[model samples]
Target: MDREALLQAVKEARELAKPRNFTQSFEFIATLKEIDMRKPENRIKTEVVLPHGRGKEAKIAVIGTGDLAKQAEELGLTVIRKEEIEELGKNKRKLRKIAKAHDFFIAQADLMPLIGRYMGVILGPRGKMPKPVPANANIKPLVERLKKTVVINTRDKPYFQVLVGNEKMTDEQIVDNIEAVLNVVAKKYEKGLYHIKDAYVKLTMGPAVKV
Candidate 1:
């Protein structure tokens, strides 16, 4: 990819897009070619930590108890206790709602088995599996890190879309985030960057600008 070319395209996209009543999210799209997405191995699924983040704080839910749970609570994150896990197991609707509300989830290492047994059905399809943290480990850093992380995946499709940033963010920040995503995707391909056919950036309501 041409870094200078991408920078200019993002700037042009920003200027071309008009303002909306609500903040418009900037999206990055990549169209793939010469790849068989039908094969499981060809699909792309991974997380990328944007240097400037997604221009907003991501909501996080911590599931555990004891000290770690207390720490998560103290951090003002949503906490789902051990006992509540069983209740969620019975209430499918409630569990789905929780999965939808949070951007990421972290769980105590010891509770992995319980979480998998009770919540796997709900989280698996959504790709919201919780990151397991050591029983005695501090999760403040992990939570903070997740707030900047965004998941990118091909999902057996020829193309993928990712939210690089919002209109509130600077074009330079959006360009950097797009570059980070492209770097990750390039590494994931067996043939590297050649797997990508083309790429574009656009606002929520604007036409795409090729990079």
Candidate 2:
């Protein structure tokens, strides 16, 4: 898609969404082609960190012990310690509640085996897998980036939608954000841009505008 047309479509999508009582966001969707869907390895799935960010705060959970737990406490986000990790897994109801409540999670690299063993089955299906980091590392930067990151995932289909920006961002900002996404999409296959049959930008519950 041309940068000029993508910018125009964003402008139109902005007005088409129609302001409501709550804040609305921008969405970029693409219809992919030339991929063999039967092969599970061909699926399009990856987490993208937007340049300008999606127009909202992303919640995070820290699952670890020792330094990791201490770091999470200082940051004042939800902290799921080693003791609670196994307990939460056994308590299926509460585990789902926490997983859905927080957008992301950071865990101690050493504790990941346990975290994966207990929570993998639940979180895997929801695309909420936690990032495991070494205990000695500082988590401030990772937390900051995850705050703005958005997940773009594809299931058994070739088409997908990704949240790029929100009503809070200027059209140009949204354009930059979508371009960031396009860069990722273009590199996913050998054909680059040719893999896109067509593309559209739209607001939540609004009509799509061709890009």
Candidate 3:
């Protein structure tokens, strides 16, 4: 669909869009049905490198060991060693401090379960869960590019929605992000055009506009 059509769609779907804060970050939060990993036909997962990321600065922290972890630190990234994770043991004060300090959590290790179990209850609700990256990959490049990485999860539904772009982004940038999100969705559900019940794009704290 073209920009105008997409914008109009967003305006029309605004009323049905679920309530989510879009302003915290210059990005849209697409809400889809809970992914049914067991259902091959229902699982729809893809990683996207947003051209400009979310058009906002994020403080990132890496938790792991080995070359990738070292490389991340060398690039001036904030690396939280495995030991640090240990230190977070049910310490409300410390966890709260870490939560307040970092914007992005890059869990390169299988520590996600630990993170989720111990901190997920707190972080997950806030969208602070460590973003999982493939293990042992060239984290240096990925870390640099991850600023633009967005995960799209679509398990089952007639509708999928994402933050097109931030209001702070130029209309063009917002439009581009919107298109990128839609295109990615299309790649997953090729029949999206036919199945699409509705769609939307809007400021997080602002009113939705049907595209």
| After superposition, candidate 3 runs with Cα above 4 Å error | 7-45, 96-104, 108-137, 154-161
Give TM per candidate.
Answer: 0.94, 0.94, 0.66
> How many pairs of residues collide in model 1?
0
Q: Which of the two candidates, 1 or 2, achieves a greater lDDT against the reference?
A: 1
Per-residue lDDT tens digits for candidate 2, residues 9-71, read 999988787667877888999888888767887677777888898898789999988988898
Question: Which portions of model 2 miss their true places by more than 4 Å?
Answer: none
- Candidate 2 vs candidate 3, TM-score winner: 2
Q: Order the numbered candidates by lDDT, best leading.
A: 1, 2, 3
- What is each predicted model's overall lDDT from 0 to 1? 0.88, 0.86, 0.62
Evaluation by lDDT, superior candidate among 1 and 3: 1
Q: What are the per-residue Cα lDDT tens digits for candidate 3 across 18-130?
A: 55745433334444333344667755555566776676644677877776588777878777776667567567587777778876678876777777667776677656777
